[PDB]
Amino acid sequence: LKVNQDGSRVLLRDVAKIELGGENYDIIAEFNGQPASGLGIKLATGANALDTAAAIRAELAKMEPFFPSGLKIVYPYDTTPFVKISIHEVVKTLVEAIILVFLVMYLFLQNFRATLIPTIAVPVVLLGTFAVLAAFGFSINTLTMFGMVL
């Protein structure tokens, strides 16, 4: 900074403290009262959601191995597994709507093969409907999966 008269040197540390710290101290988080940071990703106004979140793990997975001692990833606030429940409790519902129907067909007609023809006349129709929504633009949504049940 300076060289004062007598040959003395004023340095930057002689007037000020110097530490390596963040560029913004306005916010600091705590994971269960434990000192933590984190990436709070937000969606991109048309993005594919659960496909995008699968690829948040893509980069993250290649990063894990080169972590300092102690650094570990944890998962609060996560939407992904809600989608896994809306398929496994809808395609399960789907399957129960056959199983139960199957009985009604036997109850009224004791002929086995008769309780079969209608049991094939809906699994096929289900699939054809998947192929039209794909062709028109739509996706497997919470809504369009409820339309496979109704």
């Binding site: 993005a47 948040i56 570990k72 606030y77």
Partner: protein
């Protein structure tokens, strides 16, 4: 540093009387905090193509960048695709070789943050902490002692 009124007419207003000649637009809203931060939302019609609507908006801000402070130009200006809500929120902590809520925040933003935000169409990423920076805490008593200023 700027207070609420400072940002209101040095950044905010300048952009608002230069946010015109854009295809599709229902309205424009804005905030201007005392923490020196402004953020405008230009909402469009139902499914207006966000790939081009983003561009038109950020090719119009550009005609007003020279009429802002040099402090704001060298700071982060941005035009991004929004979705008022998070989905994946990857927390990051330490267990064995314990470190602070600042050491962890830098490692997040200097290895894995830049990869995430570009991956699978992420809108924007909010750091929950801050990336490191050569921080300098000037003492005013040891500043007058050698006859000096910031």
């Amino acid at each position: 540093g700027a207070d609420a009124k400072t940002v209101q007419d040095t950044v905010t207003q300048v952009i608002e009387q230069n946010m015109n000649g854009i295809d599709n637009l229902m309205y424009m809203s804005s905030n201007s905090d005392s923490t020196g931060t402004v953020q405008i939302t230009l909402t469009f019609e139902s499914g207006t193509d966000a790939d081009i609507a983003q561009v038109q908006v950020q090719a119009k801000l550009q005609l007003a960048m020279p009429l802002l402070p040099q402090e704001v130009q060298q700071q982060g200006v941005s035009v991004e695709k929004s979705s008022s809500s998070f989905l994946m929120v990857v927390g990051v902590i330490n267990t064995d070789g314990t470190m602070t809520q600042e050491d962890i925040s830098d490692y997040v933003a200097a290895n894995m943050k830049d990869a995430i935000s570009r991956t699978s169409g992420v809108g924007d990423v909010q750091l929950f902490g801050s990336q490191y920076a050569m921080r300098i805490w000037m003492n005013p008593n040891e500043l007058n002692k050698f006859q000096l200023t910031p």
